[PDB]
Amino acid sequence: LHDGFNFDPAIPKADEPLTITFKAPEGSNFYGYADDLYLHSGTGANWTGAPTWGDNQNKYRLKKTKDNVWSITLSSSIRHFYSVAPSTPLQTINLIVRDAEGSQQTYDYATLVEDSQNGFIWEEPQKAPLPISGEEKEGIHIHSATSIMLVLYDKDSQGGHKDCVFVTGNFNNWKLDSRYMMKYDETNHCWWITLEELTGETQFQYFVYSASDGGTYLCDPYCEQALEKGVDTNFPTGAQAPYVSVVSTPQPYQWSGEFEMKNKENPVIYELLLRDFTSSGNLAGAMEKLPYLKELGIDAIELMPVQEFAGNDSWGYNTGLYFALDASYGTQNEYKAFIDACHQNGIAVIFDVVYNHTNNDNPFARMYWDTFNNRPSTKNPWLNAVTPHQKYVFSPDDFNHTSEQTKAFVKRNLKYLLDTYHIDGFRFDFTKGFTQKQTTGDDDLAATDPARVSVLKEYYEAVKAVKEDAMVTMEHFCANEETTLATEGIHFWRNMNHSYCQSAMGWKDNSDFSGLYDTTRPNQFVGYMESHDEERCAYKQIEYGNGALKTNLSERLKQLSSNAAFFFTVPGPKMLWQFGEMGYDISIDENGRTGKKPVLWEYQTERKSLVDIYTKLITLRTTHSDLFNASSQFTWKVSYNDWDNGRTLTLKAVNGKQLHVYANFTNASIDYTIPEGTWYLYLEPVEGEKKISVPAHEFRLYTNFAE
Numbered sequence: 001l002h003d004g005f006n007f008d009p010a011i012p013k014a015d016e017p018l019t020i021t022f023k024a025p026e027g028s029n030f031y032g033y034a035d036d037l038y039l040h041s042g043t044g045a046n047w048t049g050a051p052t053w054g055d056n057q058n059k060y061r062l063k064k065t066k067d068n069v070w071s072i073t074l075s076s077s078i079r080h081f082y083s084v085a086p087s088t089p090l091q092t093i094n095l096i097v098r099d100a101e102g103s104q105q106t107y108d109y110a111t112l113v114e115d116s117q118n119g120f121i122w123e124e125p126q127k128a129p130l131p132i133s134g135e136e137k138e139g140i141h142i143h144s145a146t147s148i149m150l151v152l153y154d155k156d157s158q159g160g161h162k163d164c165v166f167v168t169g170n171f172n173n174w175k176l177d178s179r180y181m182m183k184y185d186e187t188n189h190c191w192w193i194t195l196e197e198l199t200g201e202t203q204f205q206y207f208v209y210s211a212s213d214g215g216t217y218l219c220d221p222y223c224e225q226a227l228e229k230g231v232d233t234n235f236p237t238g239a240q241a242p243y244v245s246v247v248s249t250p251q252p253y254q255w256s257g258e259f260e261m262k263n264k265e266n267p268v269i270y271e272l273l274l275r276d277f278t279s280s281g282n283l284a285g286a287m288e289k290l291p292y293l294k295e296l297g298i299d300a301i302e303l304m305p306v307q308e309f310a311g312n313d314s315w316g317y318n319t320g321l322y323f324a325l326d327a328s329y330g331t332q333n334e335y336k337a338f339i340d341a342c343h344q345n346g347i348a349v350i351f352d353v354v355y356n357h358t359n360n361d362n363p364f365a366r367m368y369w370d371t372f373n374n375r376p377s378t379k380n381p382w383l384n385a386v387t388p389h390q391k392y393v394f395s396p397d398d399f400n401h402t403s404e405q406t407k408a409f410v411k412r413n414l415k416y417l418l419d420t421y422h423i424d425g426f427r428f429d430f431t432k433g434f435t436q437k438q439t440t441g442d443d444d445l446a447a448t449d450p451a452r453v454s455v456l457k458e459y460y461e462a463v464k465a466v467k468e469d470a471m472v473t474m475e476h477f478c479a480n481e482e483t484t485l486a487t488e489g490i491h492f493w494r495n496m497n498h499s500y501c502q503s504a505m506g507w508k509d510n511s512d513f514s515g516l517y518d519t520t521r522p523n524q525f526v527g528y529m530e531s532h533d534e535e536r537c538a539y540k541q542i543e544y545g546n547g548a549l550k551t552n553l554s555e556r557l558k559q560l561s562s563n564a565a566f567f568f569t570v571p572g573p574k575m576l577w578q579f580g581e582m583g584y585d586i587s588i589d590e591n592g593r594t595g596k597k598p599v600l601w602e603y604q605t606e607r608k609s610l611v612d613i614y615t616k617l618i619t620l621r622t623t624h625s626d627l628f629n630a631s632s633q634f635t636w637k638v639s640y641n642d643w644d645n646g647r648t649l650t651l652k653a654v655n656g657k658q659l660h661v662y663a664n665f666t667n668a669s670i671d672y673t674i675p676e677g678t679w680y681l682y683l684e685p686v687e688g689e690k691k692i693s694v695p696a697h698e699f700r701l702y703t704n705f706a707e
């Protein structure tokens with residue numbers, strides 16, 4: 001390691017001078033840089049004795065001594081330089097090099113310091129075989145109330161590993177300590193240690209170190225609880241951001257009978273963001289509304305991501321930890337209590353899971369990091385250094401889904417969420433992202449990748465191996481791949497937002513509903529008028545409504561009612577986005593796309609008429625579930641050419657039950673002759689072959705059966 005930081009003495013000593021030599025590698029910020037550079041530095045986890053960013057005192061100046069080479073001497077001693085107390089262990093220096101303007105810089109790097117004065121003398125790392133075998137070796141193992149075994153995987157894509165790992169925590173006041181050095185198992189490629197005499201909430205992180213990488217603080221990627229700096233007030237002062245791991249060595253949640261999702265093959269799914277679902281923005285808030293969701297008639301709740309995400313105000317598509325759920329919504333047991341209450345109310349729970357990308361906080365990112373480019377190292381075995389799909393870069397931390405380490409981690413995580421939280425299915429976020437192919441657009445990305453199809457099958461098969469009746473849904477939008485994968489039994493998001501927005505607004509152009517019903521495999525496509533990612537139908541009305549649909553609330557709800565009568569009446573699974581049932585009309589853009597949205601439960605009263613239409617239509621799918629069987633005959637007229645004389649829907653079951661829907665989406669009344677037979681206005685007995693006047697924006701729903 002001549003590239004980057006060089007140390008003389010080669011083992012830095014707390015109470016001696018240290019000369020630091022920076023060599024700029026080729027194709028880095030400072031390669032061929034003509035002027036002197038400056039040191040931004042401090043000791044320990046919290047950068048003790050750091051200057052104000054940009055302080056250009058001669059003291060901080062790295063003199064250019066050769067081409068691409070700068071040196072600084074911390075004179076007197078490294079302790080005197082940082083003004084650290086003689087009895088305070090000086091164990092790490094954190095180092096950033098920057099230009100005089102503090103614009104161009106290197107990123108978080110630390111080296112080890114030997115402090116013999118304070119009894120921290122370096123000991124050779126020890127080789128020991130893992131005292132355990134089987135699957136799921138890595139992570140946290142409670143032996144007893146006073147004892148934990150930690151197992152941290154360490155092998156980069158080149159086959160190398162770190163020189164040593166310490167475990168710091170509340171048991172050792174967050175110091176590096178020889179007694180707390182982990183042992184390396186070369187065969188399993190794991191660091192391990194058994195902590196004993198713990199005295200109950202154990203807090204810890206790891207300090208990993210090599211000569212080529214320097215030092216890095218990171219938590220356990222398999223921790224079930226975490227404190228995050230900048231969110232948790234009780235984040236320990238001696239720990240480094242972002243994460244400490246929490247292990248209680250605990251009052252285990254007592255689950256209430258066996259649960260099975262209602263209408264398993266064609267469920268109505270309510271998409272829910274806990275942050276914006278209630279004013280409390282949490283599980284406690286959501287719990288209060290389960291009787292509302294039960295009566296609405298839904299089969300499942302789909303929670304937008306609940307795994308630990310950056311900060312505490314997010315959609316959650318920014319996961320830092322996959323085995324720890326975000327404490328901003330509630331405790332592990334509040335999550336269990338919520339899912340258990342859902343089940344008691346006959347409602348299944350689906351987790352939105354985000355395996356395309358993680359963030360800089362993830363132990364997998366922190367473990368093999370590029371301190372020059374501020375992204376994963378080319379030697380990272382889970383993550384790409386650079387996103388291969390350059391159209392969609394949601395973070396610097398894109399998962400390599402051809403990695404055997406990434407694949408095993410995903411499958412273990414899926415199994416964990418099923419076993420621990422008793423959930424009934426998954427919605428895979430951005431599965432189009434599960435690709436190593438170098439692309440820069442939508443077309444080259446959308447083009448079939450056999451390895452993406454292959455890994456998505458692996459993840460599906462893994463879920464079904466844990467829970468045979470678990471629902472798997474993917475947000476994919478790779479047309480040819482969806483045809484192939486739907487045959488395996490994977491469910492796909494079927495986005496009908498554009499059509500039902502056009503219809504809601506009273507525009508016939510691009511209003512064709514037909515995409516909602518896949519003729520080949522209707523049950524494999526989860527159709528929606530709204531998702532968290534789309535603008536609201538009821539907002540489009542205010543903004544670009546045709547005539548009265550702009551400003552007449554009565555006519556707007558009639559039109560949304562008719563949309564709903566050409567949605568819930570259709571075979572195959574369906575999804576609604578929270579508050580669509582009460583005509584939620586705040587633009588997705590209000591307070592920014594992903595910003596906190598107004599909570600408007602008063603809409604359940606003001607728009608009661610629409611809530612009642614949603615309720616009866618969804619409930620009909622349970623009361624007469626045999627109608628909605630994929631075996632049933634389904635025909636409809638919902639094209640550009642089906643407008644002026646209205647749109648029609650006929651559903652005909654094997655047992656002879658029939659549903660007929662007529663909708664006038666136009667701004668004028670249309671004359672319609674009811675089909676021949678004996679019918680019933682199921683939502684309120686009617687003779688067929690009878691001419692009716694159907695008012696502007698209204699629907700008529702007829703069943704050949706009473707209740």
Ligand SMILES: [Ca+2]
Nearest residue numbers: 309310311312
């Ligand atoms: Ca968080």
Ligand SMILES: [Mn+2]
Nearest residue numbers: 356398433434
């Ligand atoms: Mn990706």
